[PDB]
Scaffold this motif. Structure first.
Motif, PDB file in Angstrom:
ATOM      1  N   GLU A 170       0.817  -1.209   0.000  1.00 18.03           N
ATOM      2  CA  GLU A 170       0.000   0.000   0.000  1.00 18.03           C
ATOM      3  C   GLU A 170       0.855   1.266   0.000  1.00 18.03           C
ATOM      4  OE1 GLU A 170      -3.151   0.109   2.826  1.00 18.03           O
ATOM      5  OE2 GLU A 170      -4.450  -1.045   1.513  1.00 18.03           O
ATOM      6  N   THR A 171       1.989   1.236   0.702  1.00 19.14           N
ATOM      7  CA  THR A 171       2.866   2.408   0.756  1.00 19.14           C
ATOM      8  C   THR A 171       3.584   2.604  -0.591  1.00 19.14           C
ATOM      9  OG1 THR A 171       3.196   2.146   3.156  1.00 19.14           O
ATOM     10  CG2 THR A 171       4.727   3.609   2.017  1.00 19.14           C
ATOM     11  N   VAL A 172       3.932   1.522  -1.276  1.00 20.07           N
ATOM     12  CA  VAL A 172       4.464   1.641  -2.634  1.00 20.07           C
ATOM     13  C   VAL A 172       3.478   2.427  -3.515  1.00 20.07           C
ATOM     14  CG1 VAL A 172       4.915   0.373  -4.769  1.00 20.07           C
ATOM     15  CG2 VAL A 172       6.004  -0.353  -2.658  1.00 20.07           C
ATOM     16  N   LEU A 173       2.204   2.048  -3.451  1.00 26.24           N
ATOM     17  CA  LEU A 173       1.153   2.718  -4.205  1.00 26.24           C
ATOM     18  C   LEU A 173       0.970   4.196  -3.784  1.00 26.24           C
ATOM     19  CD1 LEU A 173      -1.656  -0.035  -4.633  1.00 26.24           C
ATOM     20  CD2 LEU A 173      -0.026   0.821  -6.319  1.00 26.24           C
ATOM     21  N   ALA A 174       1.120   4.468  -2.493  1.00 24.14           N
ATOM     22  CA  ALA A 174       0.958   5.813  -1.967  1.00 24.14           C
ATOM     23  C   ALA A 174       2.091   6.707  -2.459  1.00 24.14           C
ATOM     24  CB  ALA A 174       0.908   5.791  -0.441  1.00 24.14           C
ATOM     25  N   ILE A 175       3.317   6.231  -2.304  1.00 25.26           N
ATOM     26  CA  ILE A 175       4.483   6.967  -2.746  1.00 25.26           C
ATOM     27  C   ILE A 175       4.466   7.173  -4.262  1.00 25.26           C
ATOM     28  CG2 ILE A 175       7.000   6.813  -2.949  1.00 25.26           C
ATOM     29  CD1 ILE A 175       7.145   5.696  -0.224  1.00 25.26           C
ATOM     30  N   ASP A 176       4.048   6.157  -5.011  1.00 27.97           N
ATOM     31  CA  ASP A 176       4.048   6.301  -6.459  1.00 27.97           C
ATOM     32  C   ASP A 176       3.026   7.347  -6.893  1.00 27.97           C
ATOM     33  OD1 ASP A 176       4.886   5.659  -9.172  1.00 27.97           O
ATOM     34  OD2 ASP A 176       2.911   4.710  -9.392  1.00 27.97           O
ATOM     35  N   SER A 177       1.883   7.381  -6.220  1.00 25.24           N
ATOM     36  CA  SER A 177       0.863   8.330  -6.602  1.00 25.24           C
ATOM     37  C   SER A 177       1.330   9.785  -6.364  1.00 25.24           C
ATOM     38  CB  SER A 177      -0.439   8.048  -5.869  1.00 25.24           C
ATOM     39  OG  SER A 177      -0.496   8.770  -4.668  1.00 25.24           O
ATOM     40  N   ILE A 178       2.064  10.063  -5.290  1.00 26.86           N
ATOM     41  CA  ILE A 178       2.513  11.445  -5.121  1.00 26.86           C
ATOM     42  C   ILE A 178       3.625  11.758  -6.114  1.00 26.86           C
ATOM     43  CG2 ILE A 178       1.744  11.772  -2.724  1.00 26.86           C
ATOM     44  CD1 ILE A 178       4.752  11.346  -1.914  1.00 26.86           C
ATOM     45  N   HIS A 179       4.486  10.786  -6.391  1.00 25.98           N
ATOM     46  CA  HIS A 179       5.531  10.954  -7.397  1.00 25.98           C
ATOM     47  C   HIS A 179       4.918  11.250  -8.760  1.00 25.98           C
ATOM     48  CE1 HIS A 179       8.901   8.484  -5.183  1.00 25.98           C
ATOM     49  NE2 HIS A 179       8.555   9.582  -4.536  1.00 25.98           N
ATOM     50  N   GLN A 180       3.800  10.590  -9.084  1.00 25.89           N
ATOM     51  CA  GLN A 180       3.161  10.839 -10.372  1.00 25.89           C
ATOM     52  C   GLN A 180       2.614  12.249 -10.453  1.00 25.89           C
ATOM     53  OE1 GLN A 180       2.104   6.286 -11.582  1.00 25.89           O
ATOM     54  NE2 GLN A 180       0.440   7.809 -11.584  1.00 25.89           N
ATOM     55  N   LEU A 181       2.346  12.866  -9.309  1.00 23.99           N
ATOM     56  CA  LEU A 181       1.818  14.224  -9.306  1.00 23.99           C
ATOM     57  C   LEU A 181       2.905  15.244  -9.072  1.00 23.99           C
ATOM     58  CD1 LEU A 181      -1.290  13.319  -7.237  1.00 23.99           C
ATOM     59  CD2 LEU A 181      -1.319  14.087  -9.631  1.00 23.99           C
ATOM     60  N   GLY A 182       4.160  14.796  -9.077  1.00 26.24           N
ATOM     61  CA  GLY A 182       5.290  15.701  -9.051  1.00 26.24           C
ATOM     62  C   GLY A 182       5.899  15.992  -7.691  1.00 26.24           C
ATOM     63  N   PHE A 183       5.494  15.246  -6.664  1.00 18.59           N
ATOM     64  CA  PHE A 183       5.980  15.468  -5.291  1.00 18.59           C
ATOM     65  C   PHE A 183       7.004  14.437  -4.846  1.00 18.59           C
ATOM     66  CE2 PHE A 183       1.824  17.167  -5.904  1.00 18.59           C
ATOM     67  CZ  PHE A 183       1.785  18.369  -5.222  1.00 18.59           C
ATOM     68  N   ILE A 184       8.066  14.904  -4.202  1.00 15.11           N
ATOM     69  CA  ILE A 184       9.004  14.020  -3.529  1.00 15.11           C
ATOM     70  C   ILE A 184       8.778  14.179  -2.040  1.00 15.11           C
ATOM     71  CG2 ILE A 184      11.437  13.481  -3.070  1.00 15.11           C
ATOM     72  CD1 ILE A 184      12.070  14.283  -5.895  1.00 15.11           C
ATOM     73  N   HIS A 185       8.390  13.090  -1.377  1.00 18.48           N
ATOM     74  CA  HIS A 185       8.168  13.050   0.062  1.00 18.48           C
ATOM     75  C   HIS A 185       9.480  12.877   0.749  1.00 18.48           C
ATOM     76  CE1 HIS A 185       6.915  12.093   4.064  1.00 18.48           C
ATOM     77  NE2 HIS A 185       5.640  12.052   3.730  1.00 18.48           N
ATOM     78  N   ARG A 186      10.153  13.897   1.208  1.00 17.71           N
ATOM     79  CA  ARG A 186      11.524  13.518   1.542  1.00 17.71           C
ATOM     80  C   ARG A 186      11.660  13.049   3.017  1.00 17.71           C
ATOM     81  NH1 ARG A 186      16.130  16.192   3.468  1.00 17.71           N
ATOM     82  NH2 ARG A 186      18.119  15.532   2.548  1.00 17.71           N
ATOM     83  N   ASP A 187      10.583  12.531   3.614  1.00 17.13           N
ATOM     84  CA  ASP A 187      10.576  12.227   5.057  1.00 17.13           C
ATOM     85  C   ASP A 187       9.682  11.009   5.362  1.00 17.13           C
ATOM     86  OD1 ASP A 187      11.436  12.676   7.767  1.00 17.13           O
ATOM     87  OD2 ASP A 187       9.784  14.051   8.176  1.00 17.13           O
ATOM     88  N   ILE A 188       9.776   9.995   4.504  1.00 19.05           N
ATOM     89  CA  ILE A 188       9.030   8.764   4.706  1.00 19.05           C
ATOM     90  C   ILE A 188       9.546   8.018   5.939  1.00 19.05           C
ATOM     91  CG2 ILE A 188       8.533   6.493   3.766  1.00 19.05           C
ATOM     92  CD1 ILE A 188       6.917   8.498   2.396  1.00 19.05           C
ATOM     93  N   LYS A 189       8.671   7.779   6.903  1.00 20.90           N
ATOM     94  CA  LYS A 189       9.028   7.042   8.113  1.00 20.90           C
ATOM     95  C   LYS A 189       7.712   6.683   8.787  1.00 20.90           C
ATOM     96  CE  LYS A 189       9.888  11.375  10.528  1.00 20.90           C
ATOM     97  NZ  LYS A 189      10.849  12.499  10.702  1.00 20.90           N
ATOM     98  N   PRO A 190       7.727   5.713   9.727  1.00 25.11           N
ATOM     99  CA  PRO A 190       6.440   5.210  10.241  1.00 25.11           C
ATOM    100  C   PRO A 190       5.515   6.247  10.885  1.00 25.11           C
ATOM    101  CG  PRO A 190       8.184   3.668  10.798  1.00 25.11           C
ATOM    102  CD  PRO A 190       8.863   4.894  10.211  1.00 25.11           C
ATOM    103  N   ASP A 191       6.045   7.282  11.540  1.00 26.03           N
ATOM    104  CA  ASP A 191       5.160   8.259  12.176  1.00 26.03           C
ATOM    105  C   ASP A 191       4.427   9.119  11.130  1.00 26.03           C
ATOM    106  OD1 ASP A 191       7.313   9.838  11.375  1.00 26.03           O
ATOM    107  OD2 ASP A 191       7.649  10.772  13.316  1.00 26.03           O
ATOM    108  N   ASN A 192       4.836   9.017   9.869  1.00 26.50           N
ATOM    109  CA  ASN A 192       4.225   9.787   8.773  1.00 26.50           C
ATOM    110  C   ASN A 192       3.324   8.916   7.894  1.00 26.50           C
ATOM    111  OD1 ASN A 192       5.254  12.262   9.495  1.00 26.50           O
ATOM    112  ND2 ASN A 192       7.128  12.041   8.268  1.00 26.50           N
TER     113      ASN A 192
END
Ligand SMILES: Nc1ncnc2c1ncn2[C@@H]1O[C@H](COP(=O)(O)OP(=O)(O)NP(=O)(O)O)[C@@H](O)[C@H]1O
Ligand SMILES: [Mg+2]
Length: 333
Positions: free
Chosen positions: A114-136
């Motif tokens: 599910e997190t792969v899908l979440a990260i890919d969806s923001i990447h497809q919209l041009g965003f880099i989440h530069r703070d992926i960790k469990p509290d987020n």
């Protein structure tokens, strides 16, 4: 006309960050319940940057991803930024890992997928989440993953910045005691200090890809490194490079070829080990470089549908008994 603080009643504090807090609130006229994120302006970037980040965030809001928490309003006063969003009563993944210590490979498979899908969806919209960790990582009322609101606080923790390590060389660490502790003891130390770490304005680079601290720069694949670190922590009990200090952790991250190892006594599958090593290698050969399909077709995701996962039962049932149930969050004083 525009909503402000007075239109809401704070019910309870449900989360703390380095630079603000999150409350459960009730919209007075309607009785509906929301999560309200509060960020202190004095801790934020300059007003122009904040405005541009909030502007681009509305693109994400507009796209209305399944995989990002739904955001309804934002306002501000002289002190704070406020964001009104849906309350997700499953809690965050840090707290879940605190209660369970580790996850099964089947539970892990689910959350990572599910997190792969979440990260890919923001990447497809041009965003880099530069703070992926469990509290987020948040869980909704059916136990499925959503990314919490991100962008404003990226790189603000002192230890998340290159400058923090200026005169520190990349030589191997020195905490030989800590290193030779059994896995169970590493896990205990990590857990004991976990909440403070989340609230710290210094923090650590435990989840940050090595190229982020390089002059060479980085790209969106840094997020996949972070996911790999989370996957290791879910199965083992602590992220691969954790230490007593952010300096050692940094040295361990920069030397990942030697320091990324699996403790002999901990059960983990060959598939899980292989994927973790495909996530946590140099970005040029990191899994996902030629496209997210390379991640999705990894043998570790064998049973995963990937069209219907979010529409089927989640790995862990969220146990709540009211829409304002805060039992999946810690208490805050
Ligand atoms: N929509 C929400 N529903 C329920 N709990 C939430 C929600 N948003 C945040 N929280 C809780 O508050 C914690 C911290 O909020 P978070 O969004 O991470 O802000 P932050 O850490 O202060 N800043 P950031 O660096 O942008 O994440 C979460 O991990 C949850 O435990
Ligand atoms: Mg956070």
């Amino acid at each position: 006309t525009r909503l402000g603080l007075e239109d809401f009643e704070s019910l309870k504090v449900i989360g703390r960050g380095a630079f603000g807090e999150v409350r459960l609130v009730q919209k007075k006229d309607t009785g509906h319940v929301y999560a309200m994120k509060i960020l202190r302006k004095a801790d934020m970037l300059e007003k122009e940057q904040v405005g541009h980040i909030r502007a681009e965030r509305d693109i994400l809001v507009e796209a209305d991803s399944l995989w990002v928490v739904k955001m309804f309003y934002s306002f501000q006063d002289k002190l704070n930024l406020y964001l009104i969003m849906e309350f997700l009563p499953g809690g965050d993944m840090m707290t879940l890992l605190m209660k369970k210590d580790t996850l099964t490979e089947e539970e892990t498979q689910f959350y990572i997928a599910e997190t792969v899908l979440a990260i890919d969806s923001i990447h497809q919209l041009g965003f880099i989440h530069r703070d992926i960790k469990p509290d987020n990582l948040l869980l909704d009322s059916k136990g499925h993953v959503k990314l919490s609101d991100f962008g404003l606080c990226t790189g603000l923790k002192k230890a998340h910045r290159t400058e923090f390590y200026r005169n520190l060389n990349h030589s191997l660490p020195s905490d030989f005691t800590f290193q030779n502790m059994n896995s169970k003891r590493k896990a205990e130390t990590w857990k004991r200090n976990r909440r403070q770490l989340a609230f710290s304005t210094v923090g650590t680079p435990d989840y940050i890809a090595p190229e982020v601290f390089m002059q060479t720069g980085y790209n969106k694949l840094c997020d996949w490194w972070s996911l790999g670190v989370i996957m290791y922590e879910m199965l083992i009990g602590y992220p691969p490079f954790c230490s007593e200090t952010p300096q050692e952790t940094y040295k361990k991250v920069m030397n990942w070829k030697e320091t990324l190892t699996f403790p002999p006594e901990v059960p983990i599958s060959e598939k899980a080990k292989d994927l973790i090593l495909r996530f946590c290698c140099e970005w040029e050969h990191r899994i996902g470089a030629p496209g997210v399909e390379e991640i999705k077709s990894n043998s570790f995701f064998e049973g995963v549908d990937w069209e219907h996962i979010r529409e089927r039962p989640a790995a862990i049932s969220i146990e709540i008994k009211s829409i304002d149930d805060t039992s999946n969050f810690d208490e805050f004083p």
